[PDB]
């Protein structure tokens, strides 16, 4: 899904005439909820009076300073996941193909810079299997995805 350009939202922007009798492609006929969506009309408007309603949760979450606030609690213990001590080579290969599984890591973090070079100096446009970095943006700026904090020049 991460490399599928949505287009049925845009039909509501372009094909928006009373004469045009609400044209939809026949091979996308039953996707009705994909087609009539107020978000797609909302992202186009001159005044953002509906865009300032559709994501007011993020605006209130930012204006309360719930990102810059120092993280008060943290878990008292952490651990790696339990592994199997089985003394064959196949167990080690299955561990390094499931618990690490480089397809998901490549799909999550992004492309190798060598792959960026061979995709951006080529004669023709080519796609990338992680088309962008699919890691989600962390929702706490000062302390992201770890638990390792330090004293604060404030204190």
């Amino acid at each position: 899904l991460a490399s599928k350009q949505n287009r049925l939202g845009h039909m509501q922007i372009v094909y928006d005439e009373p004469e045009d009798k609400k044209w939809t492609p026949v091979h996308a006929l039953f996707q009705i909820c994909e087609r009539e969506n107020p978000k797609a009309v909302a992202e186009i408007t001159t005044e953002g009076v509906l865009r300032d309603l559709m994501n007011i949760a993020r605006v209130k979450y930012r204006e309360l300073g719930l990102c810059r606030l120092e993280k008060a609690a943290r878990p008292r213990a952490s651990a790696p996941p339990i592994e199997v001590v089985c003394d064959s080579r196949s167990a080690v290969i299955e561990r390094e193909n499931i618990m690490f599984h480089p397809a998901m890591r490549k799909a999550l973090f992004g492309p190798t810079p060598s792959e960026i070079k061979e995709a951006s100096f080529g004669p023709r446009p080519v796609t990338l299997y992680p088309p962008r970095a699919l890691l989600p943006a962390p929702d706490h700026d000062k302390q992201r995805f770890t638990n390792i904090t330090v004293p604060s020049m404030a204190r």
Binding site: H10, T45, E47, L53
Partner: protein, 459 residues
């Protein structure tokens, strides 16, 4: 592709098809046999006062009860109010046995139905460049930057709609759209105004045969303008705002692309979110952009709500932004479902009942059932003689109202099978023994069904 059938575009007959409105005067006094109703004067006058209260925008959390026995016209008055208000004012007809969920608490589906019952009308503008791309021709700058190659100051795009074409000069930072979206000659795009980043809709239909096999969607030319400056009215219910702020629709990561990929779960909504949305909607009303329009939450069968729900309804009706709550109860002295202690009137607790404008509903006279039969018969199209009307009215007075409105379809079928066009006394006297009522069924059940044996029922 899809082949259009040239048949008759009729409609289907429901139980409330003939209702077309209240049928009042210009002074509010009801008039009998008008717009579907027969009689029921005071209830239609009171519902006209309710309709006037709704369209006057003075209702801010009232509550209206519809008493009266079963089969007397409460849902008929509800659909009359919903067709009297129109379409541009919301109407959410939930039942009592629809708040019981298995994902959320049952005092939350009520609040989501309140938010479904409130509408918000927003008037805005839409400024887009539109159509199929003909040229993408750059223009060299007057002073190129030293150390680089090309230096392009204005990018030209020729957009051709289905009415007229137009050349367009643009800022050069449209290139990041065009490389990322792969826009070429013969692809319809739209360019917005607030940001200005074109997004391809598809290959046009005129270039649907330059190749043979390489196919995608072949969208037609935009049959409209090339410079839309069109204004839009847009109706969003506050339920939609609650959902779009709680669960965001479109994100770009893994876990929100699993959230829309896994099943959407109803989740309970914290009250700070609703308070914030009310505080901002009441600000955009004061700016003079959005109009608030309250609607009707017709909670049918209000005796199925237990005592844990009316407690939440007291809080929800004391909110400053709330629709009207038209209940519908058809019980006398009943035990409330939650607390099996107090026998209260209508299934409503005595604390909640004081909020309610109680509208009665009376039984029908034995010379009005035949007028309802005539209106229902000319609604379905089933025509019939006057002695047949008198026999159906006899069955209507002596048995039930809903039963004499259901001896019209098998009588019509047996009529046009026997070889006639109108229904006589013989067809109804034959169809009265193929479709027994509840009374003769209970008579067979008690008399013939003596006890549990071989050829007997299972008590």
């Amino acid at each position: 592709i899809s082949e259009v059938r040239g048949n008759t575009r009729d409609h289907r007959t429901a139980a409330h098809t003939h209702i077309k409105g209240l049928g009042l005067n210009s002074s509010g006094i009801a008039e009998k046999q008008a717009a579907g109703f027969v009689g029921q004067c005071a209830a239609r006058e009171a519902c006209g006062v309710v309709v006037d209260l709704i369209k006057a925008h003075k209702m801010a959390g009232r509550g209206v009860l519809l008493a009266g026995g079963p089969g007397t016209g409460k849902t008929a008055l509800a659909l009359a109010i919903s067709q009297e208000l129109g379409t541009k004012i919301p109407f959410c007809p939930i039942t009592g046995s629809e708040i019981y969920s298995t994902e959320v608490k049952k005092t939350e589906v009520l609040m989501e139905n309140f938010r479904r019952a409130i509408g918000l009308r927003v008037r805005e503008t839409k400024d887009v460049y539109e159509g199929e791309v003909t040229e993408m021709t750059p223009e060299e700058a007057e002073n190129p930057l030293g150390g680089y190659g090309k230096t392009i100051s204005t990018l030209l795009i020729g957009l051709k709609s289905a009415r007229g074409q137009k050349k367009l000069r643009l800022d050069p930072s449209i290139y990041e759209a065009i490389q990322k979206e792969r826009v070429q000659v013969g692809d319809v795009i739209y360019i917005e105004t607030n940001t200005g980043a074109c997004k391809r809709v598809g290959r046009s239909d005129a270039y649907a045969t330059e190749f043979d096999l390489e196919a995608e969607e072949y969208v037609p030319i935009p049959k409209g303008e090339v410079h839309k400056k069109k204004e839009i009215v847009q109706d969003v219910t506050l339920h939609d705002l609650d959902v779009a702020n709680a669960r965001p629709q479109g994100g770009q990561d893994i876990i929100s692309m699993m959230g829309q990929l896994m099943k959407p779960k109803m989740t309970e909504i914290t009250d700070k979110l609703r308070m914030e949305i009310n505080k901002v909607v009441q600000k955009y009303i004061n700016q003079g952009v959005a109009e608030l329009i309250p609607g009707v939450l017709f909670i049918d069968e209000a005796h199925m709500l237990d005592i844990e729900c009316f407690t939440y309804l007291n809080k929800a009706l004391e909110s400053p932004i709330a629709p009207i709550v038209v209940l519908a109860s058809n019980r006398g002295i009943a035990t409330i479902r939650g607390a099996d202690d107090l026998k209260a009137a209508h299934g409503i607790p005595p604390d909640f009942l004081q909020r309610l404008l109680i509208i009665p509903t009376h039984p029908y006279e034995p010379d009005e059932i035949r007028r309802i039969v005539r209106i229902r018969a000319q609604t379905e199209g089933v025509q019939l003689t006057d002695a047949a009307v008198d026999r159906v009215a006899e069955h209507g007075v002596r048995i039930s109202l809903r039963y004499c409105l259901q001896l019209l379809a098998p009588a019509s079928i047996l009529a046009r099978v026997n070889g006639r066009t109108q229904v006589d006394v013989q067809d109804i006297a034959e169809a009265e023994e193929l479709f027994l009522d509840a009374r003769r069924s209970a008579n067979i059940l008690t008399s013939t069904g003596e006890s549990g044996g071989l050829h007997g029922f299972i008590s």
